[PDB]
Design a protein around this motif. Sequence first.
Motif, PDB file in Angstrom:
ATOM      1  N   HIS A  55       0.794  -1.278  -0.037  1.00 20.09           N
ATOM      2  CA  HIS A  55      -0.191   0.036  -0.119  1.00 20.09           C
ATOM      3  C   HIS A  55       0.855   1.288   0.099  1.00 20.09           C
ATOM      4  O   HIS A  55       0.484   2.302  -0.512  1.00 20.09           O
ATOM      5  CB  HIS A  55      -0.750  -0.113   1.328  1.00 20.09           C
ATOM      6  CG  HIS A  55      -1.723  -1.069   1.331  1.00 20.09           C
ATOM      7  ND1 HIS A  55      -2.625  -1.486   2.500  1.00 20.09           N
ATOM      8  CD2 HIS A  55      -2.054  -2.416   0.478  1.00 20.09           C
ATOM      9  CE1 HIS A  55      -3.170  -2.405   2.262  1.00 20.09           C
ATOM     10  NE2 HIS A  55      -3.043  -2.826   1.108  1.00 20.09           N
ATOM     11  N   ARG A  56       2.129   1.192   0.424  1.00 22.44           N
ATOM     12  CA  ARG A  56       2.991   2.259   0.408  1.00 22.44           C
ATOM     13  C   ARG A  56       4.624   1.586   0.779  1.00 22.44           C
ATOM     14  O   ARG A  56       4.547   0.491   1.163  1.00 22.44           O
ATOM     15  CB  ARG A  56       2.705   3.052   1.694  1.00 22.44           C
ATOM     16  CG  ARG A  56       2.241   2.192   2.825  1.00 22.44           C
ATOM     17  CD  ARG A  56       2.100   2.886   3.939  1.00 22.44           C
ATOM     18  NE  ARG A  56       1.689   2.311   5.399  1.00 22.44           N
ATOM     19  CZ  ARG A  56       1.658   2.490   6.644  1.00 22.44           C
ATOM     20  NH1 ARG A  56       2.081   3.831   6.627  1.00 22.44           N
ATOM     21  NH2 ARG A  56       1.241   1.760   7.549  1.00 22.44           N
ATOM     22  N   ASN A 117      -1.355 -10.398  -0.726  1.00 19.33           N
ATOM     23  CA  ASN A 117      -2.312  -9.387  -1.212  1.00 19.33           C
ATOM     24  C   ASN A 117      -3.355  -8.893  -0.184  1.00 19.33           C
ATOM     25  O   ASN A 117      -4.172  -9.734   0.491  1.00 19.33           O
ATOM     26  CB  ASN A 117      -3.350 -10.181  -2.329  1.00 19.33           C
ATOM     27  CG  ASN A 117      -4.043  -9.398  -2.882  1.00 19.33           C
ATOM     28  OD1 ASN A 117      -5.058  -9.481  -3.731  1.00 19.33           O
ATOM     29  ND2 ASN A 117      -3.885  -7.826  -2.806  1.00 19.33           N
ATOM     30  N   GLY A 118      -2.988  -7.430   0.164  1.00 19.46           N
ATOM     31  CA  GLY A 118      -4.055  -6.909   1.202  1.00 19.46           C
ATOM     32  C   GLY A 118      -3.760  -7.566   2.516  1.00 19.46           C
ATOM     33  O   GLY A 118      -4.593  -7.979   3.321  1.00 19.46           O
ATOM     34  N   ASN A 120      -1.793  -5.869   4.672  1.00 18.54           N
ATOM     35  CA  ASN A 120      -1.717  -4.677   5.489  1.00 18.54           C
ATOM     36  C   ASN A 120      -0.194  -4.296   6.000  1.00 18.54           C
ATOM     37  O   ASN A 120      -0.090  -3.161   6.580  1.00 18.54           O
ATOM     38  CB  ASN A 120      -2.687  -4.464   6.362  1.00 18.54           C
ATOM     39  CG  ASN A 120      -3.140  -3.056   6.640  1.00 18.54           C
ATOM     40  OD1 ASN A 120      -3.485  -2.193   5.627  1.00 18.54           O
ATOM     41  ND2 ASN A 120      -3.014  -2.475   7.791  1.00 18.54           N
ATOM     42  N   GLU A 122       4.123  -4.092   5.562  1.00 20.00           N
ATOM     43  CA  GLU A 122       4.843  -3.713   4.326  1.00 20.00           C
ATOM     44  C   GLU A 122       6.472  -4.371   4.618  1.00 20.00           C
ATOM     45  O   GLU A 122       7.277  -4.149   3.705  1.00 20.00           O
ATOM     46  CB  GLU A 122       4.960  -2.324   4.121  1.00 20.00           C
ATOM     47  CG  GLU A 122       3.668  -1.570   3.812  1.00 20.00           C
ATOM     48  CD  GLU A 122       2.980  -0.969   5.065  1.00 20.00           C
ATOM     49  OE1 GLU A 122       1.826  -1.718   5.343  1.00 20.00           O
ATOM     50  OE2 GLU A 122       3.373  -0.251   5.587  1.00 20.00           O
TER      51      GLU A 122
END
Length: 379
Positions: A55-56, A117-118, A120, A122
């Motif tokens: 996500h980042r 995948n997803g 959350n 990183e």
Amino acid sequence: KKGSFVEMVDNLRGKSGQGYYVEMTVGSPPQTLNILVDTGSSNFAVGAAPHPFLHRYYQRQLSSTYRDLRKGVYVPYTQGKWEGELGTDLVSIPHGPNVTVRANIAAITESDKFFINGSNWEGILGLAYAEIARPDDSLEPFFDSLVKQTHVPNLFSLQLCGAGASVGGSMIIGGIDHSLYTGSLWYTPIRREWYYEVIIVRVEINGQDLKMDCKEYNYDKSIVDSGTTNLRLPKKVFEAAVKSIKAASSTEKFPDGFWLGEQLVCWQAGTTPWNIFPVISLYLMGEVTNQSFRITILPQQYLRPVESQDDCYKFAISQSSTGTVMGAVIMEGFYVVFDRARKRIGFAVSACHVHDEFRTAAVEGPFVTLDMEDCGYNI
Ligand SMILES: CN(C)c1cccc(CNC[C@@H](O)[C@H](Cc2ccccc2)NC(=O)[C@]2(Cc3ccccc3)CN(Cc3ccccc3)C(=O)N2)c1
């Protein structure tokens, strides 16, 4: 001695079967990142480039406090793997000890089957020893830095609470929180400081001896690995266990796929036959000679739940060819204290753990057990 770490309680989050992760910040100004807790690694690593499941990420060209070790690294995990470039920078932990240390960091550049995948999170925070940190024992692990640089006692604790969505838990750095557990905390030696290698000396399903030479329990090794979800057992011990457990559940039979984790079983809304599955006990070499203690779990631990009007579960006890791996199914029932200062590990009943009205996880002791150090594997 502080016994209430208010700041660090409930500091951990997780999405079932996908692990527990903490919030951390790197670079200056700080860049937030959801790192994953893993007592079975030793490299601190983070998403350092764009990637579909991330996500980042961490951008070295925006941290004034950045610095590059000019070296590449990669690490092979059980299934996935990543390739990154090493450096340094300032790391902090918003909900942890109010310190700010300089750690090593692999900026992950290329990865295969690593990010979920997803999920959350990183990145990963290997909390284990330097003995198995790539490129080699020279790359000082993050917790080792946090220790030499500040005053946080050399020791951390972990409370992982599953569910029956979004798993939570506490990671108390440098101390033990008295409110996370009940009863007495029992310690077991840390055989060797590479992985968190311990030793099992007797196993039993529903209080009935599995009855094997305690060497098969630690064939290769046995480790506490928060970075692993399932209770992994050697080849021989796995079969033995599934037969016994199978016997105890006989009221109802399940497809060979279930006991192999290939299939998942369901029951009408909240009508799980909890009381047919046996409890499981692992006897760990205690600290005092010929003395040992035991930790027992519940079906609510090893039948991890899976996302109509039914409650489906996946059998979380599987085979392994790399030693025994006390993963989440184990941990989610206790308050595990990774006391590095004194080369040991405590187990106490987890005050947040899932258990029904009739049975509860437990930790009991002592038991006069002889010839325990022989349960260990030598090579
Ligand atoms: C580097 N090193 C010394 C080393 C090399 C080989 C093995 C080990 C033992 N430690 C394993 C854990 O450190 C490692 C942490 C991890 C989590 C997510 C993604 C990648 C890695 N777990 C696994 O590889 C999986 C390997 C695995 C994948 C699929 C099926 C069974 C096991 C991931 N999987 C589920 C999981 C997913 C996300 C988060 C937490 C847990 C597990 O339970 N274990 C260490």
